[PDB]
Design a protein around this ligand. Sequence first.
Ligand SMILES: [Cl-]
Ligand code: NA
Ligand code: NA
Ligand code: NA
Ligand code: NA
Ligand code: NA
Length: 1283
Amino acid sequence: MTQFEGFTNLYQVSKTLRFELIPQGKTLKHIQEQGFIEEDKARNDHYKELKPIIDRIYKTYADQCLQLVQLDWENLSAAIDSYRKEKTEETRNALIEEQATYRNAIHDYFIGRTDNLTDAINKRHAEIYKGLFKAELFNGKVLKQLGTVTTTEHENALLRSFDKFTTYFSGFYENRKNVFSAEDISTAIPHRIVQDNFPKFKENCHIFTRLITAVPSLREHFENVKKAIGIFVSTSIEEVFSFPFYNQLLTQTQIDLYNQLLGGISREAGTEKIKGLNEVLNLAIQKNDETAHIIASLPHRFIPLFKQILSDRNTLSFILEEFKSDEEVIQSFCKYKTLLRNENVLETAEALFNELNSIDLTHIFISHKKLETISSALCDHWDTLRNALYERRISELTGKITKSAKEKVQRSLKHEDINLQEIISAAGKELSEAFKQKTSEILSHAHAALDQPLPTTLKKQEEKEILKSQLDSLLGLYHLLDWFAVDESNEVDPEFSARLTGIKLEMEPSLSFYNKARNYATKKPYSVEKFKLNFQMPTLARGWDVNKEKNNGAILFVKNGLYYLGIMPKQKGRYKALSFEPTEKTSEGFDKMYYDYFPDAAKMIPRCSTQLKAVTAHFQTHTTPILLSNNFIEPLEITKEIYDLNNPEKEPKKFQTAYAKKTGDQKGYREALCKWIDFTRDFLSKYTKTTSIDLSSLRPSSQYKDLGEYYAELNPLLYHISFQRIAEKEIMDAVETGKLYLFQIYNKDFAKGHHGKPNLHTLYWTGLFSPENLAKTSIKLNGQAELFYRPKSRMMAHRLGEKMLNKKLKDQKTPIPDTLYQELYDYVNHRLSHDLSDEARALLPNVITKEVSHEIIKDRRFTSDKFFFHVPITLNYQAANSPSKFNQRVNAYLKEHPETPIIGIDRGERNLIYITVIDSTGKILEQRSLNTIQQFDYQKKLDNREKERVAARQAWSVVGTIKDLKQGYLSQVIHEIVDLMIHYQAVVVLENLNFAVYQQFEKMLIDKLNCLVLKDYPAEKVGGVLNPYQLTDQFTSFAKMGTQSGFLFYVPAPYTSKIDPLTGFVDPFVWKTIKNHESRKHFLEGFDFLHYDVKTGDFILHFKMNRNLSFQRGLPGFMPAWDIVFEKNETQFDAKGTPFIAGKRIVPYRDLYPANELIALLEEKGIVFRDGSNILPKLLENDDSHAIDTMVALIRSVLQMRNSNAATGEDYINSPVRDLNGVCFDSRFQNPEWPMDADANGAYHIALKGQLLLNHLKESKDLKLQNGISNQDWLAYIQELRN
RNA sequence: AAUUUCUACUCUUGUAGAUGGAAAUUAGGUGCGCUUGGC
DNA sequence: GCCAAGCGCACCTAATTTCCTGGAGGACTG
DNA sequence: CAGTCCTCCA
Ligand SMILES: [Cl-]
Ligand code: NA
Ligand code: NA
Ligand code: NA
Ligand code: NA
Ligand code: NA
C-alpha cells in the first residue's frame, strides 16, 4: 500500500547550476591574445542594435494582419456568460474550447488560412509567415512584401555582422513564435485579444448599458466627451460600446485611442486636463446629490484594454523634452537663476507681500481651489479656514437660521474666491502671523537659492541634493504666488494684480525645470553587465555528445575531485578535432567525460527515418517499400503503412491516445501502437548511434498501453556518460599551444579550506558524476550551457591592522542591536569621534572582536573580471516528462493515512507569515509567527528597507533593491516549513489568493516541493540527491492552477480570522443594513430576549438564526440559535500572570466595556434589570432613539470578536458566545493549546479548512478533492464539529 | 565580514539555509509633478 | 493633510512563455 | 566536386 516515501521519481525537473570558471595555465593569456572577449562583446552590442530593427518586420506584419480581422464575438460572449452563471467543469471546458477556436481564428490571418480573405491575400501571408522565424528574416525579401521601406547602409552593416552567425538569433526566433502562436499562452497576440482584452471590452459594454438605462443623461455626456477629445468621429457612443466595434480595437493605435476616451488627455503641467469617461463618472459621484447615489450604486468605472504584444505605445498627452547631460541641466538652470536675479523677481515678491500690511485686503483674493492647501500650510487642520469662514458667515445671516440657509453657506465656500480680509476676520490674528512667517520663509529660501552656486557636475549625490534643494525653493515660491485668485470676476487690486501677474509669468519656467531636472537626475547610471561568450563558435556548448565535440567545442574533465571545463576554439579559422587518447587508469592525468545522447526519440526517430527527404519524396509516387542504408548497420525498411502511420492526411495519428478517444476503435489503436513501437525497435537496432544499446529491459511491444509510457521507458536508455583517463601531458600540451582553453568549474565548496556541508547545487553536481548515477541515471547533464564574462563592477574592506566585530555577544546567542553595532565597531577600531553611549559601554566587555589576519573585502567577487558557466541539468531522469494523475496519487495516500497532520500558513495583519500545525482532529501541535527567524527580525528589516527606498525616491538618490532581502527571508521560511512537512509527513494549506511576500512564498514553496533534496540524506534514500522527494504537482503557471497541488492545498480566506475557535460562531449581521431608527428598532425586535444573569453578572442576548434575516449575511451555519454574552468586565489573568479585563472591546480608537456600558445605559433609563426581566421590550416601548442606537452599537461591539490596537500590541479574539462546556473563548488567556492571537486564529482555521477537504475526501468513494469551499459549508461543518 | 548568486553569519582563508538559467514579453507597484473634484 | 478619477516622468518587481539537441540538409569554399 | 560547417528539422 501507499507510503510517504513513495512520492519520488514521478516527473522530470530541470534546473540550472551556476559556477565561476577559473582559467588555467596560459588559457587567459591566449584568450586575451586572440581578442575573443572584445569580439563577443561587440556581437552582443550588435544584437542589441539589430533586434529593434528586425522587430519592425514583426510589428508591421502583425499590425497589417490585425487590421483585416472581422469576427463575430457573440459565441465567445455566450460561453463567458455560461461559465460565470454555472461555474461547473463542463462550462469551464466549453469556454476553454471556445477560446481556442477564437485564437485559431485570429491565427488564421497570420498564416493565411482564413475564409474571410481572398486566395491571393492568404497566399502572400503564407509566404511571409514561412520565413518570419528563421534566417530568411535577414535577406530583406519580406521588406518588399510589407512596404516601400529599404535598409540603410548602417543597417546592412549590422546584418552582415551576423554572416555565418544568424543562429545567435535562434532563441529570439522562439520568443517571436511565442508572439504569433495560437496556443493558450500570455506571450501571444491571439491570447491577448481573446482572453485579456475582449472580456474587458465586453464588461465595458455592460457597464455602459446599465449606466445609461438608469441615468439616460449620461449618454449625452459620454457622446460629448468623445466629440470633445475628437476621436472615433465616425462611430456613435453606442457603437463604441457594442461588440462589432471590438474588431476595430485590435491594433495598438486603436487601443490607445479607446483608453484615452476612458482616461482623457493632459497638456503641459499646470494647465487643465481634458477629462475622459471615468473622470466624468467620478465627478458625477462626488457631487453627492440624488443622481450621484444612483450612479455610485452601479459599476461606474470603465476598464482600459491591455496593450497589443510588441506594439509601441502612443499618447495624445503632452510629453516634456528631456535634459541630456549634467551640463545641460546645470547651465540651463544657471541661466534661469541669472534671469530671475536680473528681472528682480524676489524683490518684487517681497514688496508685493509687504504691501499686504497696509493695502485694502478686501480686494486681495485667495483661490477657492487653494484654500485647503493654505489652511494646511498655515493652520493646524486642512478645514480650519473653511470652518472659520463658515462660522463667520452663519453669524451674518438674517432671520431664522435654517438648515437650507446653512447648506447655502457651505455651497458658497466651494464656488467663490475669498478676499483675504474676510479670512483674517474669520480666522483671527494668528492667521496673519502664520501668513507672515510662511511668506518670509518661502522668500528667504528662494533668496538663498538664487545666491548659492550650482555644483560643477551631478556625479555625487550631495551635488544632486544642491540642485534639488534650489528647485524645491523656487517651486515653493511658484506655489505661493498661485495662492491668489486669477478669475476676472473678482474686484482685484489693479496694480497689485498686474505686478503679481508679472512675476508669476517669470516664475512659470520653474515647474518645467523642476520636472525636467527630476526626470534626468533620477535616471539610473550605466551599469556593468555580464555578456555571453561564444569564442567565435555559433554552437558553443549547445550539446555535449562525443560526435559533436569538435563543433560544439566543449568537454568536461574531473581530476582529484575537481571539475574542469575545456573549450576548444577554431584554429586559424578552421575546426580541428583534438583527438585526446584514452590511456590506462594507472597513468597520471584527467578523467574526460564521454557523453552519448540520442535526443527525444519521439522526434529523433522520425527525423532520421520516416521523415527523410528521400522517403517523403518516394511515397508521393510509390507504394513500394524503401530501404535505408546510410548510418544503418543493416537496412531499415520503411513501408507505406509505417509512413502513413506517422503522416496521416489529418491528425490525430492512429497510435496516439487521441485516436482511441475520438474513434473508439481500440482494436485499431492498440494495433497501430504496437506496429509503431515495433518500428522504433527496428530502427534502434540498426541506426549506428543506437545499435549497441541493450534495450532488452523494455517490455514486449504489445504490452505498452500508450506511447508516452513507452518513450518514458525508452529515453533513459538513450543517454549515457562514461569517463576515460587522458594523459596529463596531452592536456597540459593542449593548453600550452592554445588548442584547449581549460577552466576549473568552481564554487566555494571546492575551496582549500572547505570543511562544512556543501550547497545543494554542489550536491546535485557531484551526485550527477557519482558512480551510482553513472550506472543508472537519476540526474542528466543537459546541453545548451552558456559561458559569460562579467567585468568588474565594484572597488570597503577590513584591512589587516584593524578589528572586526562579531554580531553576536560572547554568549554566541545575543545579537548586538544595529545602532549599537556600528558605534561599537567604530569604537574598537578607534574611529569613534565621541563618547561611547552608556548601553554600548555596558556591552563592551561582552563583545567579541577579531584580529584581521587576512583582508576580508565586501563585494570582493565583483571587484575583478570573472568568467561564469551556466549549465542545465534534469533530475528524476527515470520518470516521464510530466506526471499522470499526481493529485489522485496524493489523495490515495491521504485516504490510507487519515491521521496525516496539517500545516496551516496564513499572512497576518501584524505577521508576515504565521503557521499553525494541527493534528488530524484539529488539536494544535505548534503555532508560531515567522516575523523573526533565529533572532533576526526580518519583519523589522523589511519595513525599514521599504522606508529607506521611499526616502531615497523622494530625495532623488539610489533606490536599490528589496527583492534580495525578501528572497533571503523567504528561503529561511521555506527551510522551516519543509522541515515541518517532512517531520510530520503533513499536508500544507495556504490561502487561495483569488479571494507580495506571501504570494512569492507560495511559488517558492511549490517549486521547492517539485524536487526536494535534503542535503543530509544518503543519496540512495528518498529525499537524497539521487531520489528527490516530489510532493507538489508539476508547476506550470498560477493561472493554470487548481486548489490542489499534491500535498499543498489552497482554501478561501473568508471566515478564518473573525471566527470563534471554540464554537465556529461568526458575527452573522451585515451592519450596513442597520442604518436608521426604524431598522435599528426592527433589529432589536428580532432577538428573543436580553437579560441580566445575577449568578454571573453577564447579560445574555438570545438570537434565533431564522430571525432578522434581512440583516444577515445569508449564512445560517449549523446552530439554530446563539446565546450572545455581554461578559462581566472583571479582571482575568493569563498564563504568565498579566491581567486583562474580560469582554473588553477596542472600537473606533477607544477601549469599550460593553457590560458596564449596558448597566450605565439601563440605569440612565431607569430600566429595572437585576430582576432578570427581558430588557428589550422596555427599551423598545420607551422608544428613545439615542438609547436604542446605543443598544445596537453595544451589540455590534460585543459581536466584534477581533480587537486590535497597534499602539498597545493588542490583537486578540474574544468570542461573544460560550461553548458547550460553558467557556467564552479569549486568546488573552494565552493558553498554548488555542490560538494565541488573531493571526494565529487565522492560520488555525486555514488548516481546518484543509481538514474539511481531507474529511470529505475520506468520506468519498473517489480520489478527487472537492473544488472550493463555500462559506456556508465551512461554517456548518466547523460548527457541527464544535457543538 | 569572504559567496555561482541571495540572505543571515564569522570556531573555521570560510559557516548555515536557499538558489532554474537565458531570452522574450506583459502586468503591476513605489515615488515625484500636474488636472478636476470630494472630505 | 487624506482621498477619487486621470495624465507625464524616474526605477523596482514579478508572472509567463520557449529552449535546454544530434544529425539531415545544403550553402559556402577552395 | 568533395569537404566544411552553419542552419534548423523532428
Ligand atoms: Cl475572517
Ligand atoms: Na557550506
Ligand atoms: Na530567467
Ligand atoms: Na505611478
Ligand atoms: Na487635488
Ligand atoms: Na494620483
